[PDB]
Write an enzyme that holds these catalytic residues in place. Structure first.
Site, PDB file in Angstrom:
ATOM      1  N   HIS A 159       5.059 -11.268  15.141  1.00  0.00           N
ATOM      2  CA  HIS A 159       4.752 -11.989  16.382  1.00  0.00           C
ATOM      3  C   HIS A 159       6.008 -12.764  16.872  1.00  0.00           C
ATOM      4  CE1 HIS A 159       3.168 -14.203  19.331  1.00  0.00           C
ATOM      5  NE2 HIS A 159       3.981 -15.274  18.943  1.00  0.00           N
ATOM      6  N   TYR A 190       8.889 -14.015  20.708  1.00  0.00           N
ATOM      7  CA  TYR A 190       9.403 -15.456  20.962  1.00  0.00           C
ATOM      8  C   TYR A 190      10.784 -15.291  21.140  1.00  0.00           C
ATOM      9  CZ  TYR A 190       4.376 -16.314  21.161  1.00  0.00           C
ATOM     10  OH  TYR A 190       3.275 -16.001  21.435  1.00  0.00           O
ATOM     11  N   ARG A 235      -4.120   3.633  23.041  1.00  0.00           N
ATOM     12  CA  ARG A 235      -2.952   3.437  23.606  1.00  0.00           C
ATOM     13  C   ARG A 235      -1.875   4.510  22.525  1.00  0.00           C
ATOM     14  NH1 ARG A 235       1.483  -0.774  21.039  1.00  0.00           N
ATOM     15  NH2 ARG A 235      -0.113  -2.238  19.801  1.00  0.00           N
ATOM     16  N   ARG A 236      -0.609   4.624  22.861  1.00  0.00           N
ATOM     17  CA  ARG A 236       0.088   5.266  21.894  1.00  0.00           C
ATOM     18  C   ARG A 236      -0.265   7.140  21.927  1.00  0.00           C
ATOM     19  NH1 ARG A 236       1.920   1.758  16.585  1.00  0.00           N
ATOM     20  NH2 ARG A 236       3.434   0.501  17.672  1.00  0.00           N
TER      21      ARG A 236
HETATM   22  C1  HAS Z   1       7.721 -11.367  25.122  1.00  0.00           C
HETATM   23  C2  HAS Z   1       6.474 -10.742  24.885  1.00  0.00           C
HETATM   24  C3  HAS Z   1       5.300 -11.307  24.450  1.00  0.00           C
HETATM   25  C4  HAS Z   1       4.778 -12.432  24.478  1.00  0.00           C
HETATM   26  C5  HAS Z   1       5.805 -13.740  24.980  1.00  0.00           C
HETATM   27  C6  HAS Z   1       3.448 -12.438  24.053  1.00  0.00           C
HETATM   28  C7  HAS Z   1       2.881 -13.806  23.935  1.00  0.00           C
HETATM   29  C8  HAS Z   1       1.617 -13.695  23.491  1.00  0.00           C
HETATM   30  N1  HAS Z   1       1.052 -12.753  23.003  1.00  0.00           N
HETATM   31 FE1  HAS Z   1       1.360 -10.778  22.617  1.00  0.00          FE
HETATM   32  N2  HAS Z   1      -0.107 -10.507  21.561  1.00  0.00           N
HETATM   33  C9  HAS Z   1      -1.054 -11.159  21.189  1.00  0.00           C
HETATM   34  C10 HAS Z   1      -1.089 -12.659  21.496  1.00  0.00           C
HETATM   35  C11 HAS Z   1      -0.047 -13.220  22.256  1.00  0.00           C
HETATM   36  C12 HAS Z   1      -0.312 -14.547  22.631  1.00  0.00           C
HETATM   37  C13 HAS Z   1      -1.524 -15.498  22.195  1.00  0.00           C
HETATM   38  C14 HAS Z   1       0.575 -15.074  23.340  1.00  0.00           C
HETATM   39  C15 HAS Z   1       0.944 -16.391  24.138  1.00  0.00           C
HETATM   40  O1  HAS Z   1       2.156 -16.875  23.800  1.00  0.00           O
HETATM   41  C16 HAS Z   1       1.021 -16.270  25.686  1.00  0.00           C
HETATM   42  C17 HAS Z   1       0.819 -17.582  26.530  1.00  0.00           C
HETATM   43  C18 HAS Z   1       1.190 -17.449  27.844  1.00  0.00           C
HETATM   44  C19 HAS Z   1       0.497 -18.504  28.775  1.00  0.00           C
HETATM   45  C20 HAS Z   1       0.148 -19.639  28.380  1.00  0.00           C
HETATM   46  C21 HAS Z   1       0.824 -18.097  30.304  1.00  0.00           C
HETATM   47  C22 HAS Z   1       1.785 -19.174  30.720  1.00  0.00           C
HETATM   48  C23 HAS Z   1       2.447 -18.823  32.252  1.00  0.00           C
HETATM   49  C24 HAS Z   1       3.762 -19.205  33.099  1.00  0.00           C
HETATM   50  C25 HAS Z   1       4.648 -19.797  32.098  1.00  0.00           C
HETATM   51  C26 HAS Z   1       3.974 -18.673  34.298  1.00  0.00           C
HETATM   52  C27 HAS Z   1       3.961 -19.985  35.252  1.00  0.00           C
HETATM   53  C28 HAS Z   1       4.776 -19.459  36.369  1.00  0.00           C
HETATM   54  C29 HAS Z   1       5.490 -20.443  37.152  1.00  0.00           C
HETATM   55  C30 HAS Z   1       5.891 -21.794  36.585  1.00  0.00           C
HETATM   56  C31 HAS Z   1       6.245 -19.905  38.456  1.00  0.00           C
HETATM   57  C32 HAS Z   1       5.296 -20.052  39.781  1.00  0.00           C
HETATM   58  C33 HAS Z   1       5.910 -19.576  40.960  1.00  0.00           C
HETATM   59  C34 HAS Z   1       5.405 -19.732  42.163  1.00  0.00           C
HETATM   60  C35 HAS Z   1       6.108 -19.112  43.631  1.00  0.00           C
HETATM   61  C36 HAS Z   1       3.943 -20.535  42.629  1.00  0.00           C
HETATM   62  C37 HAS Z   1      -2.004 -10.733  20.333  1.00  0.00           C
HETATM   63  C38 HAS Z   1      -3.300 -11.197  19.571  1.00  0.00           C
HETATM   64  O2  HAS Z   1      -3.299 -12.419  19.314  1.00  0.00           O
HETATM   65  C39 HAS Z   1      -1.545  -9.479  20.245  1.00  0.00           C
HETATM   66  C40 HAS Z   1      -2.333  -7.948  19.528  1.00  0.00           C
HETATM   67  C41 HAS Z   1      -3.081  -7.481  20.393  1.00  0.00           C
HETATM   68  C42 HAS Z   1      -3.704  -6.283  19.419  1.00  0.00           C
HETATM   69  O3  HAS Z   1      -5.013  -6.220  19.525  1.00  0.00           O
HETATM   70  O4  HAS Z   1      -3.033  -5.415  19.104  1.00  0.00           O
HETATM   71  C43 HAS Z   1      -0.266  -9.060  21.045  1.00  0.00           C
HETATM   72  C44 HAS Z   1       0.408  -8.082  21.042  1.00  0.00           C
HETATM   73  C45 HAS Z   1       1.483  -8.000  21.640  1.00  0.00           C
HETATM   74  C46 HAS Z   1       2.376  -6.848  21.763  1.00  0.00           C
HETATM   75  C47 HAS Z   1       1.883  -5.315  20.980  1.00  0.00           C
HETATM   76  C48 HAS Z   1       2.801  -5.075  19.650  1.00  0.00           C
HETATM   77  C49 HAS Z   1       2.281  -4.091  19.168  1.00  0.00           C
HETATM   78  O5  HAS Z   1       3.020  -2.877  19.563  1.00  0.00           O
HETATM   79  O6  HAS Z   1       1.242  -3.658  18.503  1.00  0.00           O
HETATM   80  C50 HAS Z   1       3.582  -6.932  22.334  1.00  0.00           C
HETATM   81  C51 HAS Z   1       4.714  -5.983  22.370  1.00  0.00           C
HETATM   82  C52 HAS Z   1       3.334  -8.466  22.862  1.00  0.00           C
HETATM   83  C53 HAS Z   1       4.428  -9.187  23.633  1.00  0.00           C
HETATM   84  C54 HAS Z   1       4.578 -10.355  23.723  1.00  0.00           C
HETATM   85  N3  HAS Z   1       3.136 -11.267  23.532  1.00  0.00           N
HETATM   86  N4  HAS Z   1       2.301  -8.927  22.347  1.00  0.00           N
HETATM   87  C1  HEM Z   2      10.266   1.951  33.961  1.00  0.00           C
HETATM   88  C2  HEM Z   2       9.331   0.879  33.123  1.00  0.00           C
HETATM   89  C3  HEM Z   2       8.524   1.238  32.095  1.00  0.00           C
HETATM   90  C4  HEM Z   2       7.590   1.866  32.256  1.00  0.00           C
HETATM   91  C5  HEM Z   2       7.107   2.938  33.253  1.00  0.00           C
HETATM   92  C6  HEM Z   2       6.913   1.909  30.789  1.00  0.00           C
HETATM   93  C7  HEM Z   2       5.750   2.351  30.851  1.00  0.00           C
HETATM   94  C8  HEM Z   2       5.285   2.389  29.385  1.00  0.00           C
HETATM   95  C9  HEM Z   2       3.801   3.000  29.046  1.00  0.00           C
HETATM   96  C10 HEM Z   2       2.860   3.730  30.072  1.00  0.00           C
HETATM   97  C11 HEM Z   2       3.623   2.654  27.518  1.00  0.00           C
HETATM   98  C12 HEM Z   2       2.485   3.213  26.779  1.00  0.00           C
HETATM   99  C13 HEM Z   2       2.587   4.524  25.970  1.00  0.00           C
HETATM  100  C14 HEM Z   2       1.646   4.907  25.135  1.00  0.00           C
HETATM  101  O1  HEM Z   2       0.647   4.027  24.747  1.00  0.00           O
HETATM  102  O2  HEM Z   2       1.566   6.079  24.701  1.00  0.00           O
HETATM  103  C15 HEM Z   2       4.725   1.837  27.139  1.00  0.00           C
HETATM  104  C16 HEM Z   2       4.563   1.644  25.980  1.00  0.00           C
HETATM  105  C17 HEM Z   2       5.792   0.673  25.445  1.00  0.00           C
HETATM  106  N1  HEM Z   2       6.579   0.117  26.248  1.00  0.00           N
HETATM  107 FE1  HEM Z   2       7.077   0.573  28.326  1.00  0.00          FE
HETATM  108  N2  HEM Z   2       7.525   0.940  30.140  1.00  0.00           N
HETATM  109  C18 HEM Z   2       8.614   0.787  30.961  1.00  0.00           C
HETATM  110  C19 HEM Z   2       9.384  -0.543  30.504  1.00  0.00           C
HETATM  111  C20 HEM Z   2       9.606  -0.903  29.166  1.00  0.00           C
HETATM  112  C21 HEM Z   2      10.420  -2.109  28.794  1.00  0.00           C
HETATM  113  C22 HEM Z   2      11.419  -2.734  29.652  1.00  0.00           C
HETATM  114  C23 HEM Z   2      10.038  -2.800  27.768  1.00  0.00           C
HETATM  115  C24 HEM Z   2      10.490  -3.918  26.915  1.00  0.00           C
HETATM  116  C25 HEM Z   2      11.757  -4.161  27.172  1.00  0.00           C
HETATM  117  C26 HEM Z   2       8.913  -1.756  27.304  1.00  0.00           C
HETATM  118  C27 HEM Z   2       8.305  -1.609  26.011  1.00  0.00           C
HETATM  119  C28 HEM Z   2       7.318  -0.968  25.731  1.00  0.00           C
HETATM  120  C29 HEM Z   2       6.457  -0.898  24.335  1.00  0.00           C
HETATM  121  C30 HEM Z   2       7.262  -2.128  23.072  1.00  0.00           C
HETATM  122  C31 HEM Z   2       5.632  -0.035  24.096  1.00  0.00           C
HETATM  123  C32 HEM Z   2       5.014   0.311  22.891  1.00  0.00           C
HETATM  124  C33 HEM Z   2       5.436   1.287  22.061  1.00  0.00           C
HETATM  125  C34 HEM Z   2       4.857   1.735  20.968  1.00  0.00           C
HETATM  126  O3  HEM Z   2       3.403   1.294  21.014  1.00  0.00           O
HETATM  127  O4  HEM Z   2       5.097   2.352  19.850  1.00  0.00           O
HETATM  128  N3  HEM Z   2       8.673  -0.789  28.275  1.00  0.00           N
HETATM  129  N4  HEM Z   2       5.462   1.846  28.315  1.00  0.00           N
HETATM  130 CU    CU Z   3       1.723 -11.711  18.300  1.00  0.00          CU
END
Ligand code: HAS
Ligand code: HEM
Ligand code: CU
Ligand code: BNG
Ligand code: BNG
Ligand code: BNG
Ligand code: CUA
EC number: 7.1.1.9
Lengths: 33, 544, 166
Positions: B220, B224, B436-437
């Site tokens: 996790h 971050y 997925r996957r």
């Molecule tokens: C950098 C990438 C990631 C971030 C950041 C991230 C954040 C969270 N995640 Fe996650 N995540 C999970 C929970 C969270 C939670 C609670 C947060 C939190 O930290 C998120 C908090 C977000 C917010 C509170 C929203 C804030 C919004 C903002 C800051 C935008 C404001 C916009 C502005 C200011 C601009 C305005 C502009 C104008 C023009 C108006 C959980 C479960 O509890 C799973 C497991 C799922 C499963 O079943 O397998 C999970 C699974 C994943 C996986 C899959 C891993 C795998 O392969 O199995 C990835 C890669 C990932 C990435 C990331 N995750 N997360």
């Molecule tokens: C051209 C842009 C991209 C497309 C079209 C794309 C598409 C996808 C798709 C459809 C999957 C799901 C595959 C599956 O579940 O079998 C996937 C998985 C994934 N992608 Fe991307 N992706 C892109 C860019 C990226 C980038 C830039 C990152 C992160 C830097 C990213 C990270 C991942 C990860 C971590 C997975 C999961 C791998 C796993 O489960 O083993 N992808 N992406």
């Molecule tokens: Cu996590």
């Protein structure tokens, strides 16, 4: 105007999006129980 | 004079190269989730690719592990160095770049040779080739050198400035690196104690449950680790690029401090669906996970307020007038902002997954990926792409043409649009239970019910291929083409009378670190002690 | 202008925080609710129950498929399931509706997912360990089992079936 109104709107949209996704999946949850 | 620039550039380029290669598989994967089997084609272009899964391993390893880490090592070492106007220890800095490069090359070989098609999470018993684990380990240990280098920079600045509060960017980098150190221990422990001796043949089996538990300890916080380098730029540089200022130094510090305290002790949220792990502990990790979500909710406001302030400052019209007033002409500004927009649905998806029981609805479905591409593949990756239009000019001296400017601007919107479109196709297909996957296009009649979301996936697949292509163009364009002496776009900060008190409290880094470590021991210790007291290693398999 | 805006930002920051914490606690409550309710059944048992993956299909509850389904009480039934590369045993799984089904799942090879389409049953199956999930199908029909955890080249075609007798 000067009030963070613009930012308040942003965290409002955010809050609504969290609410939809959440309660929404919570619904799917009981619909699958 | 500034030898840190070369090294930073090498981390960045190597990272973007990892992004190009890894992302090549992206489009074919989107089409796959669009039920379109384009892998026969992919194989004609890349004859070494043996399967959908080998392609996916490369995708996850090169994008989510290699590119992200390299971008963080570049940003979180170079920004503090520049803010402090002090030289990082260059011997270590280069050593860190060589470990990354060598570890990468060593892991690449087995991967490209179809000897480690186990995915970026490499869950035992799936057993990969020793060079994969060895190379991954060295690639990751590279960050320990980066940690030493930043703490060394901080240490040296304190000595020369006793009684003074740590400058903003350096405060972010120090707690960031201390957090990563604490977070890396899970994976380092998994590698050193099991994966390495196992793939080397010293042991026959590994316990699957303790392996996933140590993995997610790091699993996790590593996201971050991926996010914060982007938050550092969004807090300290984007406000200036936006034409305003960072509205609050203290709140930025608080967000980073909460990440140091809460990023690591929440891993069970990736194990809600795992046996042998007490439900009570899962609830505790669920609560803590909702807490770590707080720093980002706060960030949502501080950043939005900063963009609003900048908007109203340059003609900001009404309640939303400040929006159109922003520099939508600069790709450096656009990339991160679009990324934050998508980060909104991205975050909600996250809060849902963290809700324990609700996870059973989406766990392991196409939903997770839809959710995280808005996170790392969108917010993070777009912020990195945006740095091409300011950090590269800063590091090379070569400016951005009105042409290069328009291109990257095209790359960014198409990339953001592709991700939003794909996010629709994946969350939906996921609610429709598509796994997925999985190479579902190979089983064409397997998911009839998701015919419509699949259209989005094919669409997204096309859009993103274009984006990637334009990106590869723009990237080599900006580097081989022919401000450097101008400092980094660090923004000015609006201070207040309350700042000082808050800032001094948060500046007690040593104390907060111990608290962060204590939290990790309390959250993982009971479970791990019970696990190591009842280990059950099982034999490896090569099912590919 | 900046100080005036600064004052209102730290002010609204605290409120924002106050609201966020509160909202998070409501979610917490709505989660606790599901825990006390009977829906907490799809939650894997926390007690460690080890087994040997290399012998699970030769000696024990998973060896003879015909013995997979067992009556463990009044309207209750334990179903020893075996997930492997690449399928499920028994296949199909036949169980009575309205009955509490205690699934005890395990693997002789790698990790597999056990996702029963239409239900909340979604559990990781780890070799050497037994995953115990509970569920009462309140409606007859065919419930497809999907392996949602990459387990090798035959992953996309790894399906099972749970026929709930009417
Ligand atoms: C950098 C990438 C990631 C971030 C950041 C991230 C954040 C969270 N995640 Fe996650 N995540 C999970 C929970 C969270 C939670 C609670 C947060 C939190 O930290 C998120 C908090 C977000 C917010 C509170 C929203 C804030 C919004 C903002 C800051 C935008 C404001 C916009 C502005 C200011 C601009 C305005 C502009 C104008 C023009 C108006 C959980 C479960 O509890 C799973 C497991 C799922 C499963 O079943 O397998 C999970 C699974 C994943 C996986 C899959 C891993 C795998 O392969 O199995 C990835 C890669 C990932 C990435 C990331 N995750 N997360
Ligand atoms: C051209 C842009 C991209 C497309 C079209 C794309 C598409 C996808 C798709 C459809 C999957 C799901 C595959 C599956 O579940 O079998 C996937 C998985 C994934 N992608 Fe991307 N992706 C892109 C860019 C990226 C980038 C830039 C990152 C992160 C830097 C990213 C990270 C991942 C990860 C971590 C997975 C999961 C791998 C796993 O489960 O083993 N992808 N992406
Ligand atoms: Cu996590
Ligand atoms: C696994 C252990 C690897 C140890 C590698 C030690 C490398 C020492 C640093 O060499 C560096 O090479 C750069 C070009 O690449 C030069 O620009 C830089 O001035 C030079 O100092
Ligand atoms: C840091 C350098 C490490 C070099 C390691 C070299 C030895 C690799 C041992 O691999 C083992 O080969 C066996 C026979 O083929 C397989 O049965 C077994 O599953 C596999 O684990
Ligand atoms: C992306 C946001 C919009 C999503 C719209 C479609 C959501 C469908 C959720 O229904 C689910 O369908 C499954 C079969 O596919 C059933 O097994 C499950 O019991 C049921 O709850
Ligand atoms: Cu078994 Cu995928």
């Amino acid at each position: 105007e000067e009030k963070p109104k613009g930012a308040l709107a942003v965290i409002l949209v955010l809050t609504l999006t969290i609410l939809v996704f959440w309660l929404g999946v919570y619904a799917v949850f009981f619909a699958r129980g | 004079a500034y030898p840190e620039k070369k090294a930073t550039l090498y981390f960045l380029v190597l990272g973007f190269l990892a992004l190009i290669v890894g992302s090549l598989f992206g489009p074919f994967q989107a089409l796959n989730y669009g039920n379109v089997d384009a892998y026969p084609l992919l194989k004609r272009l890349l004859p070494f690719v043996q399967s959908y899964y080998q392609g996916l391993t490369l995708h996850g390893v090169l994008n989510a592990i290699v590119f992200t880490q390299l971008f963080a090592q570049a940003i979180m070492v170079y920004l503090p160095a520049r803010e402090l106007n002090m030289r990082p220890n260059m011997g270590l800095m280069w050593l860190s770049w060589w470990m990354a490069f060598i570890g990468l090359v060593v892991a690449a070989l087995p991967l490209l040779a179809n000897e480690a098609t186990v995915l970026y999470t490499f869950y035992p018993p799936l057993k990969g080739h020793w060079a994969f684990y060895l190379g991954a380990s060295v690639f990751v240990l590279s960050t320990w050198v980066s940690i030493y280098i930043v703490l060394d920079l901080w240490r040296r600045w304190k000595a020369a400035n006793p009684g003074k509060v740590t400058p903003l960017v350096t405060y972010m980098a120090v707690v960031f690196w201390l957090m990563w150190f604490l977070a890396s221990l899970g994976l380092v422990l998994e590698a050193v104690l099991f994966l390495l001796p196992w793939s080397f043949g010293l042991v026959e089996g590994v316990d699957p449950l303790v392996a996933r538990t140590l993995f997610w300890w790091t699993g996790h916080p590593i996201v971050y680790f991926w996010l914060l380098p982007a938050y550092a730029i969004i807090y300290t540089i984007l406000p200036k690029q936006a034409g305003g200022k960072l509205v609050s130094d203290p709140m930025a510090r608080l967000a980073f401090l909460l990440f140091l305290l809460l990023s690591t002790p929440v891993g069970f949220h990736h194990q809600f669906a795992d046996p042998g792990i007490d439900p009570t502990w899962k609830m505790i990790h669920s609560v803590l996970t909702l807490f770590v979500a707080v720093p980002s909710l706060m960030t949502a406001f501080t950043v939005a307020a900063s963009l609003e302030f900048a908007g109203r400052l340059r003609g900001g019209r009404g309640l939303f007038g400040w929006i159109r007033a922003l520099p939508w002409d600069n790709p450096a500004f656009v990339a991160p902002v679009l990324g934050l927009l998508g980060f909104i649905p991205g975050g909600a998806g996250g809060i849902v997954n963290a809700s324990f029981t609700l996870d059973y609805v989406v766990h392991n479905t196409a939903w997770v990926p839809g959710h995280f591409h808005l996170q790392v593949a969108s917010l993070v990756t777009l912020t990195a792409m945006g740095s091409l239009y300011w950090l590269l000019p800063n590091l090379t001296g070569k400016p951005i043409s009105d042409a290069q400017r328009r291109l990257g601007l095209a790359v960014v919107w198409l990339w953001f649009l592709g991700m939003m479109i794909m996010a629709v196709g994946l969350h939906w297909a996921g609610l429709l239970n598509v796994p997925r996957r999985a190479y579902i296009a190979q089983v064409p009649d397997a998911y009839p019910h998701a015919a419509v979301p699949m259209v989005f996936n094919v669409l997204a697949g096309i859009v993103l291929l274009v984006a990637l292509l334009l990106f590869i163009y723009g990237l080599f364009s900006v580097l081989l083409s022919r401000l450097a002496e101008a400092p980094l776009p660090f923004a000015e900060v609006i201070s207040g009378p309350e700042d000082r008190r808050l800032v001094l409290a948060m500046d007690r880094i040593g104390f907060w670190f111990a608290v962060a470590a204590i939290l990790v021991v309390l959250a993982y210790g009971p479970t791990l002690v019970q696990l190591f007291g009842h280990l059950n290693p099982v034999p490896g398999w090569r099912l590919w | 202008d900046e100080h005036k805006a600064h004052k209102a930002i730290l002010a609204y920051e605290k409120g924002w925080l106050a609201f966020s914490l509160a909202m998070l606690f409501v979610f917490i409550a709505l989660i606790a609710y599901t825990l006390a309710t009977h829906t907490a059944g799809v939650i894997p048992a926390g007690k460690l129950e080890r087994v040997d993956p290399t012998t699970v299909r030769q000696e024990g509850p998973w060896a003879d498929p015909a013995q997979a389904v067992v009556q463990t009480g009044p309207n209750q039934y334990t179903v020893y399931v075996l997930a492997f590369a690449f399928g499920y045993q028994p296949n199909p799984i036949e169980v009575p509706q309205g009955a509490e089904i205690v699934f005890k799942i395990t693997s002789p090879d790698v990790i597999h997912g056990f996702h029963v389409e239409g239900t909340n049953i979604n559990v990781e199956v780890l070799p050497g360990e037994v995953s115990t999930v509970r569920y009462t199908f309140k409606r007859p029909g065919e419930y497809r089992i999907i392996c949602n955890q990459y387990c090798g080249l035959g992953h996309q075609n790894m399906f099972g079936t749970i026929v709930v007798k009417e």
